[PDB]
Amino acid sequence: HSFDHYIGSAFDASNNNVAVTGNVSATLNVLAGDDKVSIDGNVEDVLVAANVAVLDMGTGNDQLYVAGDVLGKIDAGTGNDEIYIKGDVSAAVDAGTGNDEVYIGGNLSGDLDAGTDNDNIQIGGDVNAALNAGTGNDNLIIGHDVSGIVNMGTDNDTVEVGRTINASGKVLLDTGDDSLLVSGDLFGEVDGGTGNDTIIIAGKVSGNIQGGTGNDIVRVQSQVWAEANISLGTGDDVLIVEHELHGTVAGNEGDDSIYLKFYTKEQYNNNSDLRNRVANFEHIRVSDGVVKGSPADFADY
Ligand SMILES: [Ca+2]
Ligand SMILES: [Ca+2]
Ligand SMILES: [Ca+2]
Ligand SMILES: [Ca+2]
Ligand SMILES: [Ca+2]
Ligand SMILES: [Ca+2]
Ligand SMILES: [Ca+2]
Ligand SMILES: [Ca+2]
Ligand SMILES: [Ca+2]
Ligand SMILES: [Ca+2]
Ligand SMILES: [Ca+2]
Ligand SMILES: [Ca+2]
Ligand SMILES: [Ca+2]
Ligand SMILES: [Mg+2]
Ligand SMILES: [Mg+2]
Ligand SMILES: [Mg+2]
């Protein structure tokens, strides 16, 4: 089915191929079948009832390409769906059940739900709204900042943030054995949730990190400012701090280790505020030896 300006058409249970060279200005529903839809323009803000999809890929393993922006809701439905939107997304996107693959080249400012099963989400710009990866072992890669709330849901999820988790932003890894890497700064919040999680912050931390229950490892590579709070939760946790440590840090319950790579024994022994900040840790290693307990060597860092 070929269209320039799409203003409405009926599809069916066949495996459709829909080519739109212009904009989508009515509802588009390719229904059952493994359908392919390609739109060179925008999915427009078509008037529909609350939470109704403008573009519905339906049941089936469907494949969607949009070269422009998405301003009306997309539902990929059931099935293992593949979505590629080059532009910005300002409407809701629901990849549904199935192992879905979602690529958004621009910013995400509508709420995304990857739904059940094991989804791949890639956002070239910022995550400004809700992003729910759902159940399943999900993979989320963000090019720029998180200003909204990312919830990776149950199972063993991976998040990589290319820039900064802003003051308003959160990344909640939830249950499962999750991995987070923030390449910029953490001004908002991160929560590992239950399970044995790995959290790595390359930039500075002024916001909050919770390891949650489980035996977690947190590594911060730049300055931890005074207002920051890093709590490792119950379980047997490790905190590696590669630079200045001004903020509040807690091992909480369990057998907890801290590596202060930036401070030598000489500094530690001459800085009562630093010693008091980290005294709650069972094991404490500094740059040139051990000051408390029996920490691991941490030779990797
Ligand atoms: Ca169809
Ligand atoms: Ca379909
Ligand atoms: Ca589908
Ligand atoms: Ca789906
Ligand atoms: Ca899904
Ligand atoms: Ca999922
Ligand atoms: Ca998940
Ligand atoms: Ca999880
Ligand atoms: Ca977790
Ligand atoms: Ca945890
Ligand atoms: Ca923990
Ligand atoms: Ca602990
Ligand atoms: Ca402890
Ligand atoms: Mg499935
Ligand atoms: Mg931005
Ligand atoms: Mg920024």
Domain with 86 in it: what CATH number?
2.160.20.160
**Cα 142–chain centre separation:** 7
Residue 105 counted as an annotated binding residue: no
Is the Cβ–Cβ distance between 287 and 263 less than 8 Å?
A: yes
**Cα 119–chain centre separation:** 12
Residue 69 counted as an annotated binding residue: no
Residue 44 C-alpha to ligand 3 middle, in angstroms?
20
Residue 161 C-alpha to ligand 16 middle, in angstroms?
11
Is the Cβ–Cβ distance between 35 and 29 less than 8 Å?
A: no
Residue 282 counted as an annotated binding residue: yes
Going by C-beta distance under 8 Å and a sequence separation of 6 or more, which residues neighbour residue 29?
Answer: 11, 53, 55, 56, 58
Resolution in A: 1.7
Structure-block tokens of residue 229: 């709070």
What is the spatial distance between Cα 143 and Cα 141, in angstroms, rounded to a whole number? Answer: 7
Provide the domain limits for residue 174: 1-301
Ligand 9 (ion): residues with CB under 5 Å are: 173, 176, 178, 192-193, 195, 197
Structure-block tokens of residue 51: 């939470």
Q: How many domains does the chain have?
A: 1
Name the nearest CA neighbour of 169 among 140, 184, 201, 147. Answer: 147
3-state secondary structure of 17: strand
End-to-end CA distance of the chain: 57
Q: Is the dihedral of CA 215, 172, 162, 81 positive or negative?
A: positive
What is the spatial distance between Cα 58 and Cα 111, in angstroms, rounded to a whole number? Answer: 19
What is the spatial distance between Cα 135 and Cα 117, in angstroms, rounded to a whole number? Answer: 6
What is the spatial distance between Cα 250 and Cα 256, in angstroms, rounded to a whole number? Answer: 9
Q: Determined by which method?
A: X-ray
Percent of the chain as helix, strand, coil, to the nearest 5:
5, 35, 60
Residue 79 C-alpha to ligand 14 middle, in angstroms?
7
